[PDB]
Design an enzyme around this catalytic site. Structure first.
Site, PDB file in Angstrom:
ATOM      1  N   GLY H  30       0.590  -1.317   0.729  1.00 40.46           N
ATOM      2  CA  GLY H  30      -0.063   0.243  -0.027  1.00 40.46           C
ATOM      3  C   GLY H  30       0.710   1.269  -0.065  1.00 40.46           C
ATOM      4  O   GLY H  30       1.707   1.657  -0.672  1.00 40.46           O
ATOM      5  N   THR H  31       0.372   2.380   0.429  1.00 38.24           N
ATOM      6  CA  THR H  31       0.559   3.535   0.783  1.00 38.24           C
ATOM      7  C   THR H  31       1.817   3.657   2.503  1.00 38.24           C
ATOM      8  O   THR H  31       1.363   2.319   3.333  1.00 38.24           O
ATOM      9  CB  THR H  31      -0.438   4.726   1.018  1.00 38.24           C
ATOM     10  OG1 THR H  31      -1.304   4.629   2.115  1.00 38.24           O
ATOM     11  CG2 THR H  31      -1.160   4.436  -0.346  1.00 38.24           C
ATOM     12  N   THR H  32       1.911   5.086   2.238  1.00 38.00           N
ATOM     13  CA  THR H  32       2.719   4.852   3.791  1.00 38.00           C
ATOM     14  C   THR H  32       1.489   5.760   4.698  1.00 38.00           C
ATOM     15  O   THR H  32       0.695   6.620   4.572  1.00 38.00           O
ATOM     16  CB  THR H  32       4.003   6.247   3.793  1.00 38.00           C
ATOM     17  OG1 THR H  32       4.831   5.427   2.856  1.00 38.00           O
ATOM     18  CG2 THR H  32       4.053   6.332   4.924  1.00 38.00           C
TER      19      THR H  32
END
Lengths: 77, 243, 242, 102, 72, 233, 243, 245, 82
Positions: H30-32
């Protein structure tokens, strides 16, 4: 698997033959691994060095070294 | 049916693959434990490490206080340890209402064993991996150590160890108990009981450990308490006060 | 839960389990029904090879579904009890509720319906039985003959034959019946039924069981004595056509 | 003890005519001698040329109506916006009314 | 790179064709150029218009081809 | 292998999610092209209706859920119905319990949860259908994208169906202009038809394929169906 | 066995595809809806003296305004009819009027979705989908005469004429040429017989064909054996005088 | 080896089921998102990816509230994270009624823990593939916790997960050391914003939109609120000052 | 390139094509032969013409008939099943 002690010695040894700006804190570098033996540690050294060829220098910062050990850890175990 | 390790059913050999693998690699999680019996206490020493400076090690728990008096030492991982803790806690509480009495180590051990066995026969559940050592100082038996292990097997101990420095711990206590002709040492204060534990620990695992690398849980009559970080250093310095 | 699959499609647009149900019927014994225009005859095999059977408590092939309706079968007895029981209940259910004697068409729909369910519905398999259902509708003197398969499909047939060597008995029957002139007298329609079923039972004249159904609950099972007599006769007929 | 059932008064009047029809109602709402409302529409358009009034006890009116409002909605969805007939609506109510009598 | 090698009518917009192809690889964009030419071969044209390429995509390239619009 | 992780809906695979789920995302593209667009006061839905034959009559690609709401489907039909009933049920209850219409956002998050549950259930399946759900609640005009694995996004504009990327290029350019026209229905509507014919490249447009639905600040769920879409081309 | 939730790389379920295979093996059902009626015709087929051929038919009445002809497996079409009668009867009681043919198809298609292991969305109680497709023909006072093709997959389309069965590829092709928008009930029935004759490898009799019609002064009406044969009698002579 | 890649109803010899390994992997994919504990509170920040101008700001925030004082943000796959939270919410409503008190951050860790662990005793239920970072202020102090997808969870001083996990721990570990724990809650927004900036350097194929929220007992009064307006705007500037590029 | 499943119009053409070379006596429409195939492959078609010729040779014949072609469809498809 190494000790915390084993990693430190090998980071210090690899960066001793190496040309650097700044005293390096090997102790952080050890934390940033978890059981890297001498070959894994060498990949981290060259990785730092790659941003230094780009930064048009034969020296490396502390700053390079923190980033470098972590990128090698992530790309495998 | 299916197969003997895609679902839990007997092996060709009459063995169960899942229980034997539950014994092995659930104690190699950087955990080693011992429990020894006091005179009027029960001592547990267990390893407990934090690999970040950013992980608050207070929440890190692997000695749990099941009730105000009961402790349970888990060897094995936190996903499993909380399935067993929830069961333990519930059992403890239920017991207290229904039978009007505080929960003995032995009864809890026995109940949890039989339950794990049922989950071992199930074809849509696993036996938990954890090894559970239940401790208190019962007023119906004195200091007690009872350990369950994952197969639905369980048995009482007077002193136990787990992790592959089992042999080292055992031999030091055995020789000692054969000479003194007792399996419990005599000393009132908890402090001297923890010093006895450390002596056998240090020799046997061949190392000493920091405050935040240890976790020590002490059972007393009607209390179980964990020793603060300074309190665990006080003891390590106190033997070295002697030296 | 055991409502999950146990009957699946074929890639050919059959069903594997229905194709395998029909095989059990073929290996089996033979049952036949031949129509007059006064009766409906049902022949059923009882080929006792062994002589250590006691045959008054050896199961029969003839069930009442109702007092004017019969069911005969070829297939596993075990499965057939389960179907036979549900079909008796359904005759009594109508009788109770409609205040009316049972009509043959609806019963056939019912027999078809339980078998049809068990192919469609999960964690059950169809029965190992094909049936013949026959009888007479109330206040009616014309014969009724239905066939149902454990596929759950259903049809009417002037005559039909099932089980082992179905081909042989259809093929024969086809030469000895016309819808425009079917038999009027019991004796000659029975003669024909016994003769077809002789040719597949091998030796049999006590091993063949005839039951002749005339309108509204006149249902009478002819005996060995009587059958032996028709077989004699058939041995006289076969050297009058030589 | 308890029975909520009472009365709340009001008066409605329906007249079928030659091409038309009315549902006339007063707008006063009571409980005994106290005034609950001095305007509160006591004839309401349920849609489809159907206007409706449940005079008597209020508490049942509100309920009867809500059950029915969702039926007007469901009839439309399930049958592609085909408008509800006075006779059909009357049958639908019969079933509602009959659904509680316990 | 593809369109240097071979004739085109010099109107063809790579960006637009690129939106029209979903989950294409480099080798497969090269096979579209061949199919665009097979339309052209039948049509009696020696170059390719935009249309000629659109039609090329519709035909197989054997690993992925955008042409989906069936469902009733 | 493919066949190893495919048989039941309960397994993850090294990819990060199950193969079957990707095949559900793929089906949407097969089914009908539908574009979604909004300004900030109204939101417009444009959908191409397809049939199978000359003597076949169209299948509806707009299903009206309320007198202030409707949705378009693209992909598998049978699931699109099972979903539109659920949304009907959800809507009504909100009105019965809370006097509430049902926000697009609010509906999206309930719909997502239902989708996780049917992707942890082994006999269960991904729906295999994506939906563009439009509404004007008291949150303003809205367009949401629903995907049948529980992915819910709020957007200015988007497309599902045949060359989604196709329409998306058009919308992204003309974006800044049409969305600041706030209080003129007709323009946003006219941009919708202008877009959809350029996504097409192996189909053509016509009057009785097209069907337009608008909802807004002063437009209650209204469909222009057949003939009456001519005056937006 | 075979997945019940496992799709093709396109995203079309195995079970749906397999549903399409049984359909293609039945005998043709052909409908033409006209402005005075709906005609549904079937090939019943089979003629034998050991067969009662005029006691079996494939055109079954649902209601006093709704029929269906089928093609595919016939055993399957019995469960579809049992569901459909119950749903139509309950709606006539609640609102006193005709149920819509499209509405009926959706109610049935909902229960066509169960097969296999259950869901948490749905309780799947069956084992396969239905292996029959149907042409349901009716009348309603709010769309007049109509003709509908229900696929067991879930899709149902309204048509003005459609053929299904084994011999549908040819049949449909003929339907279009013969179809126009001033077609009437009487012409349509004659034409049905033309199509049926053409594709037969036999002589057309009413013990291999059955006609049916819809007029709104009588509802769904079966064109009886006696009338269907009179129509067959008229066909054979007129055709056999164009040669 | 095998059977442990399709199931969870039996135990690996590695002590770690192959299906469980795959669940962790989708988290890093995913994203941070990160989480910062401070000397009075917690501040949460996330990188929201900008792909196209067809997306709308602050309606696709990945910060979701539970109760009143717990803010919950995640890395991994969207549907898993929302279903996990919807379950948190339901337990939270139940909690509040029964015990007449708000749901703890430690309690909520347990609630989540037991739903995940349940799906890792069964092959018939498939577990979650998100790591959720959450926390708040309660009657018994300030808490930051991180839930990982095994059903492992602990309280942390600082946390990161996602694509940008490493770069985030580096930039965080320097700032926390310098401070006692992360100084003031005000300061923590500026600090946060620097962490997101460094974490962006692993993306560079999408632009980002910065979104922060906080829960603070000295500058919010125990409620979870977004950080927007002036406070967000000074934070973008601080990041771009010290971090150059 | 496909060599999988052809159309009704298509099956007809391949039948028509193998039976040109053969003598035949009248009453054949290819369409009728095609009709009995619910699904075929090209292999199956080649089998229908050649099998139809065999029923004729057993009876001792050079010609092929509508009856023969039907008889060959029934045999071939049914064996292919399962």
């Amino acid at each position: 698997l190494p000790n915390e002690a084993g990693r430190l010695e090998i980071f210090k040894i690899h960066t001793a033959k190496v040309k650097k700006t700044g005293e390096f804190d090997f102790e952080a570098a050890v934390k940033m691994s978890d059981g890297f033996n001498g070959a894994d540690i060498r990949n981290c050294a060259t990785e730092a060095g790659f941003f230094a060829i780009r930064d048009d220098r034969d020296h490396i910062n502390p700053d390079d070294l923190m980033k470098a050990v972590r990128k090698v850890a992530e790309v495998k175990k | 049916a299916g197969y003997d390790r895609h679902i839990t059913i007997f092996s060709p050999e009459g063995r169960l693959y899942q229980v034997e693998y539950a014994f092995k690699a659930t104690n190699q999680t950087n955990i080693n434990s011992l429990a020894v019996r006091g005179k009027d206490c029960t001592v547990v020493i267990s390893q407990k490490k934090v690999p970040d400076k950013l992980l608050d090690p207070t929440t890190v728990s692997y000695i749990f206080c099941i009730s105000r008096t009961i402790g349970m030492v888990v060897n094995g991982p936190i996903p499993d340890a909380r399935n067993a803790a929830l069961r333990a806690k519930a059992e403890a509480a239920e017991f207290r209402y229904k039978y009007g009495y505080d929960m003995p180590c032995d009864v809890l051990a026995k109940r949890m064993a039989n339950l794990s066995q049922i989950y071992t026969q199930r074809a849509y559940m696993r036996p938990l991996g954890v090894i559970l050592t239940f401790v208190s100082v019962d007023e119906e038996l004195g200091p007690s150590i009872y350990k369950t292990d994952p197969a639905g097997y369980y048995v009482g101990y007077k002193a136990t160890a787990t992790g592959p420095k089992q042999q080292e711990i055992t031999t030091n206590l055995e020789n000692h108990f054969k000479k003194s002709k007792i399996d419990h040492i005599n000393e009132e204060s908890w402090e001297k009981v923890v010093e006895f534990a450390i002596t056998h620990m240090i020799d046997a695992l061949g190392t000493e450990f920091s405050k935040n690398d240890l976790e020590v849980g002490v059972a007393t009559k009607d209390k179980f308490f964990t020793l603060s970080a300074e309190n665990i250093e006080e003891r390590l310095v106190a033997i070295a006060e002697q030296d | 839960g055991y409502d999950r699959a146990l009957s699946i499609f074929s890639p050919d647009g059959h069903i594997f389990q229905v194709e395998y149900a029909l095989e059990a019927v073929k290996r089996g014994t033979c049952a036949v029904g031949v129509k007059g225009k006064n009766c409906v005859v049902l022949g059923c095999e009882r080929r006792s090879t062994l002589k250590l059977q006691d045959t008054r408590i050896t199961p029969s092939k003839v069930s009442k579904i109702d007092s004017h309706v019969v069911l005969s079968f070829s297939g596993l007895n075990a499965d057939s009890r389960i179907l036979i029981e549900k079909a008796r209940v359904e005759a009594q259910s109508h009788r109770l509720t409609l205040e009316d004697p049972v009509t043959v068409e609806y019963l056939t729909r019912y027999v078809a319906g339980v078998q049809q369910r068990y192919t469609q519905s999960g964690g059950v398999r169809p029965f190992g039985v094909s049936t013949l259902i026959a009888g007479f509708d109330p206040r009616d003197d014309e014969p009724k003959l239905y066939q149902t398969e454990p596929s759950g499909i259903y049809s009417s047939w002037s005559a039909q034959t099932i089980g082992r060597n179905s081909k042989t008995v259809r093929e024969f029957l086809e030469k000895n019946y016309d819808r425009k002139e079917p038999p009027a007298t019991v004796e000659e329609c029975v003669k024909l039924t016994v003769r077809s079923l002789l040719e597949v039972v091998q030796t049999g004249a006590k091993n063949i069981e005839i039951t002749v159904v005339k309108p509204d609950s006149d249902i009478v099972a002819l005996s060995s004595e009587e059958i032996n007599q028709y077989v004699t006769q058939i041995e006289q007929e076969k050297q009058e056509q030589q | 003890q308890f029975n909520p059932y009472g009365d709340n008064g009001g008066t409605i009047l329906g007249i079928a005519g030659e091409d038309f029809a009315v549902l006339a109602g007063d707008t006063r709402n009571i409980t005994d001698y106290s005034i609950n409302s001095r305007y509160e529409p006591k004839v309401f358009d349920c849609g489809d040329n159907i206007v409706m009034s449940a005079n008597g006890f209020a508490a049942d009116g509100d309920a009867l109506v809500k059950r029915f409002k969702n039926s007007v909605k469901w009839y439309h969805f399930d049958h592609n916006d085909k408008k509800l007939s006075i006779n059909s609506a009357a049958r639908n109510i019969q079933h509602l009314l009959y659904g509680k009598r316990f | 790179i593809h369109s240097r090698k071979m004739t085109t009518d010099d109107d063809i917009n790579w960006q637009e064709l690129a939106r029209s192809t979903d989950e294409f690889n480099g080798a497969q964009l090269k096979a579209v150029t061949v199919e665009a030419g097979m339309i052209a071969l039948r049509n009696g044209q020696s170059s390719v218009k935009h249309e000629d390429f659109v039609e090329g995509i519709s035909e197989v390239q054997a690993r992925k081809s955008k042409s989906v619009s069936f469902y009733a | 292998f493919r066949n190893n992780y495919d048989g039941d809906t309960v397994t993850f695979s090294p990819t990060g999610r199950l193969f079957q789920v990707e095949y559900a995302l793929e089906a949407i593209k097969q089914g009908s092209v539908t574009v979604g667009l909004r300004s900030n006061t109204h939101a417009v839905l444009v959908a191409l209706k397809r049939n199978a034959d000359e003597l076949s009559s169209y299948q509806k690609k707009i299903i009206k859920c309320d007198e202030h709401m409707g949705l378009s489907l693209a992909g598998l039909a049978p699931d699109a119905r099972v979903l539109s009933n659920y949304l009907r049920q959800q809507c009504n209850y909100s009105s019965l319990v809370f006097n509430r219409k049902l926000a697009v956002e609010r509906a999206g998050h309930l719909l997502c949860d239902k989708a996780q549950k049917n992707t942890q259930s082994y006999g269960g399946r991904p729906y295999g259908v994506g939906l563009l759900i439009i509404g004007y609640d008291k949150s303003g005009a809205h367009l949401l994208e629903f995907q049948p694995s529980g992915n819910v996004t709020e957007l200015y504009g988007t497309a599902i169906g045949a060359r989604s990327q196709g329409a998306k290029t058009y919308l992204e350019r003309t974006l800044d202009t049409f969305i600041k026209i706030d209080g003129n229905p007709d323009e946003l509507i006219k941009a919708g038809v202008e877009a959809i014919s350029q996504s097409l490249r192996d189909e053509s447009l016509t009057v009785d394929n097209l069907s337009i639905a608008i909802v807004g600040k002063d437009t209650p769920f209204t469909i222009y169906d057949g003939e009456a879409v001519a005056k937006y081309i | 066995d075979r997945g019940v939730s496992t799709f093709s790389p396109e995203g079309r379920l195995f079970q749906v595809e397999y549903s399409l295979e049984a359909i293609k093996l039945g005998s043709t059902a052909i409908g033409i809806a006209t402005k005075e009626g709906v005609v549904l015709g079937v090939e019943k087929r089979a003629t034998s003296p050991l067969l009662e051929s005029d006691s079996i038919e494939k055109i079954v009445e649902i209601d006093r305004h709704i029929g269906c002809a089928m093609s595919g497996l016939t055993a399957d079409a019995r469960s579809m009819i049992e569901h459909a009668r119950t749903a139509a009867v309950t709606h006539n009681l609640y609102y006193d009027e005709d149920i819509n043919v499209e509405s009926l198809t959706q109610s049935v298609c909902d229960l066509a979705l169960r097969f296999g292991e259950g869901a948490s969305g749905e309780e799947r109680l069956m084992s396969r989908p239905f292996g029959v497709a149907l042409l349901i023909a009716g009348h309603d006072a709010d769309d007049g005469y109509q003709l509908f093709h229900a696929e067991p997959s879930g899709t149902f389309y309204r048509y003005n004429a459609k053929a299904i069965g084994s011999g549908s590829e040819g049949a449909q092709a003929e339907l279009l040429n013969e179809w126009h928008s001033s077609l009437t009930l009487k012409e349509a029935e004659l034409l049905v017989l033309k199509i049926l004759k053409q594709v037969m490898e036999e002589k057309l009799d009413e013990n291999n064909a059955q006609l049916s019609c819809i007029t709104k002064q009588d509802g769904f009406k079966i064109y009886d054996n006696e009338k269907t044969a009179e129509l067959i009698k008229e066909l054979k002579e007129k055709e056999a005088a164009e040669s | 080896g095998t059977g442990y890649d399709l199931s969870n109803s039996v135990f690996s010899p590695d002590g770690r089921n192959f299906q469980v390994e795959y669940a962790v992997k989708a988290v890093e994919n995913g994203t941070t998102s990160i989480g910062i504990k401070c000397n009075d509170g917690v501040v949460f920040a996330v990188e929201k990816l900008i792909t196209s101008k067809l997306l709308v700001p602050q309606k696709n925030v990945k910060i979701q509230v539970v109760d009143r004082h717990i803010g919950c943000v995640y890395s991994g796959l969207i549907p898993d994270g929302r279903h996990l939270v919807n379950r948190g919410r339901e337990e939270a409503a139940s909690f509040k009624k029964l015990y007449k008190t708000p749901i703890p951050i430690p309690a909520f860790a347990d609630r989540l823990g037991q739903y995940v662990q349940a799906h890792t005793l069964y092959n018939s239920v498939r577990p979650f593939g998100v790591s959720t970072i959450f926390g708040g202020v309660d009657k018994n102090g300030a808490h930051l916790y991180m839930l990982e997808p095994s059903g492992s969870y602990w309280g942390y001083k600082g946390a990161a997960t996602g694509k940008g996990r490493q770069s985030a721990k580096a930039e965080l570990e320097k700032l926390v050391d310098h401070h006692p724990e992360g100084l003031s809650a005000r300061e923590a927004v500026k600090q946060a914003a620097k962490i997101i900036y460094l974490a962006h350097e692993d993306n560079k194929e999408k632009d980002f939109e910065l979104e922060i929220s906080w829960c603070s007992l000295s500058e919010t009064n125990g409620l979870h609120k977004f950080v927007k307006g002036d406070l967000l705007q000074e934070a973008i500037d601080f990041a771009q000052k010290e971090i150059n590029g | 390139v496909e060599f999988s499943l052809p159309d009704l119009e298509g099956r007809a053409n391949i039948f028509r094509i193998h039976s040109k070379s053969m003598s035949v006596e009248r009453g054949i429409r290819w369409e009728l032969i095609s009709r009995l195939c619910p699904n075929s492959t090209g292999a199956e078609l080649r089998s229908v013409c050649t099998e139809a010729g065999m029923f004729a040779i057993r009876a001792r014949r050079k010609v092929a008939t509508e009856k023969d072609f039907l008889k060959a469809v029934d045999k071939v498809i049914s064996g292919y099943k399962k």
